[PDB]
Amino acid sequence: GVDVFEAQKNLVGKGKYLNTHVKAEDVKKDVNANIKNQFDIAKIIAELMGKALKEFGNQQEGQPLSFLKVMDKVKEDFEKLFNLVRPGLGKFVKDLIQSSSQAENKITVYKLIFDNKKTILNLLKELSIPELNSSLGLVDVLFDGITDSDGLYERLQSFKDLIVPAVKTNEKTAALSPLIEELLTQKDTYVFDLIQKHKGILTNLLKNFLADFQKSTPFMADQVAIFTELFDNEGAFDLFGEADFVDKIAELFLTKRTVKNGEKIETKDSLLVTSLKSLLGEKVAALGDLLDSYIFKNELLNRSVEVAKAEAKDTKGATDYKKEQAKALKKLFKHIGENTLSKTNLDKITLKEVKNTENVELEETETTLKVKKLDVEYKVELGNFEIKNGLIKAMLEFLPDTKDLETTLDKLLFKGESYKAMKDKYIKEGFPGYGWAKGVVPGAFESIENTFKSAIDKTKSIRDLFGDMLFGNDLSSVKETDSFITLGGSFDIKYGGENLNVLPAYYSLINSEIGYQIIGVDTTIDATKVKVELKNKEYKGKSPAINGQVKLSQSFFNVWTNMFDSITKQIFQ
């Protein structure tokens, strides 16, 4: 055949395939449907985590709820999602997430495969590896003369005597040999049961794929790093089985790791802490110690495995941080599910067409196909997307509630590396103009510290300080139903261009299904005309943590408000 560019010699032209098979009305409708489907899949994704998250959060303590038992409660949504990402991929995913022991209605792997065979063929042809096509040449021969999944199972059992030696002899699939084994051994195979049962091999391939992606995608290196750290444990595949997702995600992502056997590497911390260390590498330094005392040393984010049964050995209520952290995660899931990403809250985000009338004329001249003038604009109206108090109040509750705020703030402000140097320099000499007054100095940098220390309320923790910084008013006096951040207005999408080339777009492997791509589309996301307003822009607190004549919680809140306005002016629109 013709690889990628000898194809674009007999496929486009004056009256050749692409030009005569792509119409101006077709181009216009597909361009509009591109934005429409992107918005629709974004909305379905947002509601999906917000329909499953509500079930996660509302689950009672001590009652396990797996990652897949909740998948059924949103199964249709997945279908919708995946019937909008790719036409025809609606039954496959809805069947896939029902192919597990935790699903309400089990369906076998053979039922999963025979029904949506064409969709599986497209997905396999979309894989980046060429060699898979060698295994794809017998799929049509495999599915010939088959009317039900039972016949497919029988024919695969007949062909096993040739399939399994080829799999074993291939070094790439040599480790895979057990998998396909029971794919021909039991008629009641389930994809997710296999995934949770073949933990080691699947983790090995996942680690290799993630390492390859890291070597290929340095820009998202943090996400691949956290994924690899997650999948370094075989038990990380217990999510796709009979487990508790609201607990497994806590013991995988918010729990210290000891994945080694030499002497001890238990100091590996948690996944979230390592991700914060990577993402806050050197952006902030002085407050990093704060992160060391409140973010890197909290049992709700760093559960400190094997240390709970070290000094107590009696299981106190506070000692067991595996359920308090699970409760905090469940509360966060509750709020993100039914208060932020709910159907009602997501309903006030409307993608309205603006012009959608101009005809996208196509000009053909020899081996070319260009769009005369593409100009479509869609207004995404954010309505009033009330991010209520609780999306960030739950994250505040993740922070420890230890009342020891004086010592931590003293260490952060005064017992630092820069303030101490200035202290010493002013003690030995200094105070310009005065000079001879050196005994005054250890009476000057002592009340300067003393008033700051005495301002800090003895009964307020870092939760209260962060509530003053963000909410303004005190946490106990801040209503969870109020909106912390409200998104209003609308932002424009301005797909545009002149003389834009239209060229054939193929799948990853050899396939008879082809699309077309318009290259060089100026996709201007004019994010202006949106207002990300802090509803609590004034300090309403009555018992500030650092109140007094040296009120810093109010100053910190004003700093937060100003920095939020700056972020919404530069990072946003």
Next chain:
Amino acid sequence: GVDVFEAQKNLVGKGKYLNTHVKAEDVKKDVNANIKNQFDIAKIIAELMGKALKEFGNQQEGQPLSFLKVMDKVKEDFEKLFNLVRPGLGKFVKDLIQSSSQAENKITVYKLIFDNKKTILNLLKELSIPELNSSLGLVDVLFDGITDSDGLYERLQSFKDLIVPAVKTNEKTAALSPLIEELLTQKDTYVFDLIQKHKGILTNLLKNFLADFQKSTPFMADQVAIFTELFDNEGAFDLFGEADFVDKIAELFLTKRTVKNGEKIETKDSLLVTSLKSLLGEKVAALGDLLDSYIFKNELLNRSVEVAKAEAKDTKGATDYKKEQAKALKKLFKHIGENTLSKTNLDKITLKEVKNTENVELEETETTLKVKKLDVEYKVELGNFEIKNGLIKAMLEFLPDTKDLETTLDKLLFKGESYKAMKDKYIKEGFPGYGWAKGVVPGAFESIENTFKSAIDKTKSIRDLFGDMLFGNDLSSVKETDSFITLGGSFDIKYGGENLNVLPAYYSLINSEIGYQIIGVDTTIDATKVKVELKNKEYKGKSPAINGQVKLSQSFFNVWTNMFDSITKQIFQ
């Protein structure tokens, strides 16, 4: 004759004049008497200001007491002083200070001159000007055949017909012509009456002499500068007449000057302020503003002439600062007279001989005369020279008692030239490590100033602050009878040398009286073994001016104590 060095050819030698007229016992006794007489004249000077100062201070308000009416009350002391500075100069000064209208027993100029004619001859021969000897050639002829002052007056009247044309024709004495005029016109001439009556001419010669001394003595330029500024006014000679010294010294030394007539130069300030400006030129800069608000702008040191009758025009009690300042000066004189430089307090300073036994052998060999081995040592035992509270408490009372201490200290500390620059720099950017927290800065350098300002007691003035800095305890609770500084121990004087040349020493002019001088005497003043102790080395105050958690009056007091110890370790012994 032989000028200075051809004289030291026939005056010293083997058996020549100086060698055969100066004995080893004579050298020893004169060397011992040098230290003894220096100590004695120092003690008599100290008691003199301390016997006259007591009379100055104890004088009631509104009763004038001239500089010379008190001179009589100590007249004998002057004689003692001046009979120890130079033998025979005992009757002359005691007669001189009685030759005024303010003296209790008036004596004429002729009585002053004929009696101690020889002493006047020595003093005139001690004047630096050579030409005076031309007028000294007729003194012996003038005093021939005279038995009383009446005969001297008659002979000067006879010789006036030749004396006064010579005085008039001489340009140097041309301005002097009126003076000698009444020196032959009235038989009841008084030296100090003439001095106070011939103000202009005497001020002119004094100004010329002081300018010459300034051109000759740059090291004591400040003293000559204040003297010239003092004598720039003719009325400055009103001290030697019918006036009030405790008031005249206040209106000459602690009063603004307006000595000009062009438009106005009243901003010339006082003599003490100008002397402080010269002596505190650039040693202290930041606290100079303090001196601007409390030392340069106080009516007790800068009386602000012609401004009292400018805005009030009703003579309020506080407005008339000419008697409040006079009262403060009288209180200081009272304390220095009968508490610090009293006879009882000065009695505990003993000059004791240590060895005073070694013979000062003299070796003569050709034109030389050397001391074989001079070694005398005298111990000055300071006893307990209690400088009581009041030598410095009165000077504290000279400072204004305005309760406005907050504004002045705020200007000195915060509203300065260096703190404001740091303020601006930290406001625009800064706070290293933080960076993004710029709104916190106008909440940081606001309590830093606020606590310092709030510490300052509203009812305490600079007098109280200086009392805390120096005395420790509050001024109202500090007893004036207690000793601020006590001098104890003793210091040694170690006149020494080997092979020290002894050569003739002559007067300023041609004279028949000659002394001898030993050159190169190592006069080691070993000031060690003395203890200048602050009796109040601990803060006993109960109402400090800057009390609180930012106690600065206590810190200032500790700084003062440490700096006093440093001064007594380096400036002292």
